[PDB]
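Q: Could you predict the 3D structure of Endothiapepsin?
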Amino acid sequence: STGSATTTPIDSLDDAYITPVQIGTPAQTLNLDFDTGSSDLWVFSSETTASEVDGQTIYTPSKSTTAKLLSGATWSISYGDGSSSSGDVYTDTVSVGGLTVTGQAVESAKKVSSSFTEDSTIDGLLGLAFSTLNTVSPTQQKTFFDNAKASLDSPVFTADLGYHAPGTYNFGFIDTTAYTGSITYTAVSTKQGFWEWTSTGYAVGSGTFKSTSIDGIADTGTTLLYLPATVVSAYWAQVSGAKSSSSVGGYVFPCSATLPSFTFGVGSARIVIPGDYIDFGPISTGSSSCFGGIQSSAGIGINIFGDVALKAAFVVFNGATTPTLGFASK
Ligand SMILES: O=C(Nc1ccc(Cl)cn1)C(=O)N1CCCC1
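A: Sure. Here are the predicted structure tokens for Endothiapepsin:
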């Protein structure tokens, strides 16, 4: 089997991407944030505290003839941005782009933090990291991809995120028309439960390439590119008027400035992030200060190749016995 679904930016800045997912019988379609940095499929639901729901579409398990309570199961998760959610668990039928998993753990939110409430466009998350990170207790549950894997034509999924435009998640096949050149594959460590890999270096604009190992994670659920402070300083030093603002919480720049591209290495191959991808607009309405899309990972404890980086590439998440990551230009 295979599946193929369109993923759409939630706003004009590509702050996140939502993908429609069918849950239950008859189908309840929710727009979920596909997150290769986590491993829980959780949804706004009829069980979510009423005051914490504000425009989201909810899953109502009592209206699904295939829903079954996973008795005694609870879940609770926190994300890198300080957001969180928790609740209980049902198993149900879940379909993505024509690909169906029966008995998928669907984690129903009883509580969500304010950032989730305040984002009306995201109805939940669909985690695509390794199932070892899944938070369900007492019995850890498998991700949608892990459940589908054995049925798939090939044990892979791909992320093809758009810049200010829709893109595609495919399951079970590699669309050879979706990228240019070749796909370069690179080793993955699953020891932290992430799609963790090592970039071979970087360049800023037309500058020479710096060969240096940068260990990080391929994370579709993180908006920006977070790299070591040295690398980030070297980037913004090439932007007239750019500065790191502690009050804003990162690098900002006057949008009268022209942003250079940023290149990162995948083995001997190179992915070029165009400068425009690094502009996240005014820090507040009407401000002449813009927020940068490349920021320091210092104090995160890990480098994160988030959407800013991934949307410059066609990315293969290869779930073979020894997982690997593939990157192509597009
Ligand atoms: O928290 C996240 N990323 C993130 C955000 C900020 C920083 Cl410094 C680091 N990481 C994240 O992956 N998600 C997915 C759902 C909404 C939040």
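Q: Anything worth pointing out?
A: The CA atoms of residues 48 and 211 lie 49 Å apart.
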